[PDB]
Design an enzyme around this catalytic site. Sequence first.
Site, PDB file in Angstrom:
ATOM      1  N   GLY A 174      17.142  31.197 -42.241  1.00 46.76           N
ATOM      2  CA  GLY A 174      18.038  32.335 -42.500  1.00 46.76           C
ATOM      3  C   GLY A 174      17.291  33.408 -43.275  1.00 46.76           C
TER       4      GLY A 174
ATOM      5  CG  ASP B 132      24.027  23.767 -41.707  1.00 45.82           C
ATOM      6  OD1 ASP B 132      24.096  23.393 -40.505  1.00 45.82           O
ATOM      7  OD2 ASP B 132      23.097  24.430 -42.198  1.00 45.82           O
TER       8      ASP B 132
END
Lengths: 134, 290
Positions: free
Chosen positions: B27, B140
């Site tokens: 990310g 996640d």
Amino acid sequence: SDLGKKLLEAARAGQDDEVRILIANGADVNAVDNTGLTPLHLAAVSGHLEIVEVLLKHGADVDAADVYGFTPLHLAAMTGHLEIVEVLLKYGADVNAFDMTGSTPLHLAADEGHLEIVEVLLKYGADVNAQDKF
Amino acid sequence: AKEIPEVLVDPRSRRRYVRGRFLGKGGFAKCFEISDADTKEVFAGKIVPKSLLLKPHQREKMSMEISIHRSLAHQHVVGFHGFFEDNDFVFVVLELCRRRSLLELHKRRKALTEPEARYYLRQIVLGCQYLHRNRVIHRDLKLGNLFLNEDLEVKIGDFGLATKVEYDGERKKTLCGTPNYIAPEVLSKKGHSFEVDVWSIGCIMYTLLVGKPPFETSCLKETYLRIKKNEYSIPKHINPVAASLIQKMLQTDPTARPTINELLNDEFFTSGYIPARLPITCLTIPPRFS
Ligand SMILES: CCN1C(=O)C(/C=N/c2ccnc(N(C)C3CCN(C)CC3)c2)=[SH]C/1=C(/C#N)C(=O)NCC(F)(F)F
């Protein structure tokens, strides 16, 4: 590399003659897999002495570090392969190489109880107080 | 776009951290080895450029990761040491996990022996039980954020997609990103809760014992249809107790999966050998009595 992938597979599986062929046909002896293992790492950890020697003579990087920071000597020391430990040191392996925990082949051999390897590494100048700094 | 300072200065304590080697990214984040210039203590420094935090869902992720992780302390959760910022970067100081993650282990070993799967899975489930009892859903869980320390102890990390349950029976309706193992209720309109973490552990269990993921194909559409229809096959060589526990976790109806405590108490965790210690060779080649 297609020959790189094949050479990694041959070295892991201990296929001596498939290793000599791939090298002769242009295989990168310094081919690296998806976690930094080279043919030398894979032969060293699997106990394939003849393939270790073949790779070292064909210029295999003796101190190649994988994604843990292991050199082929770290892997040979933790698996107890004395002849491979010696061949690797003779080809100039750093006896005090550090993995990403600050461990030398000697620390790893001692932890696994490979005391013959601990003795050999001390003979080739392994330093018990080896310390990695920033 | 700004270069990362070579020395990280906490403006509160004025502790200086020297930036060492690149470890990883994902990310908006890069992670680096950092060391206290005075104490020589070594940490993982997560470093996030404020240039990548201009959108609401991105500022939400950074702030939520920090507020959730800073409140956590458990044997199976990444150590949280602090956070600070300058004009250009947010800095998060974490426990360095020197033995990488279950992703690296998975790429080298593929299928583990059952005793090794049992060793790792119990630590994952203990860490997740501590999260669920503190009202934290990770959302996640993946091989790559199941980190290993020097003792091959599992540390859960990367709380960027995590949420806090605010009241009993709450169904969260939003996520600030896309989970690795998409639960079927995330694919639906009905909302989700703790049971997404149990789905992901089911996927991780299948992957550790089988050596490939249960649903993933080449086409994201085929994968999502397989999840919605609960279509997967457990190969016939998996022991029956292990296969049965994968089937309890990989069910469409989330109320039918075991809770994290029912999962911890499954027969799988007691049906065979429980290694004390794995040897360091287990990162590269299979063990014998394990
Ligand atoms: C839990 C803290 N944490 C770690 O401790 C990490 C440790 N990574 C290591 C440890 C040991 N060695 C390496 N190497 C790359 C070595 C470099 C030299 N080379 C020869 C050998 C490998 C990497 S990565 C991390 C993260 C977190 N949180 C994180 O990656 N998170 C995801 C992110 F970044 F996307 F935000």
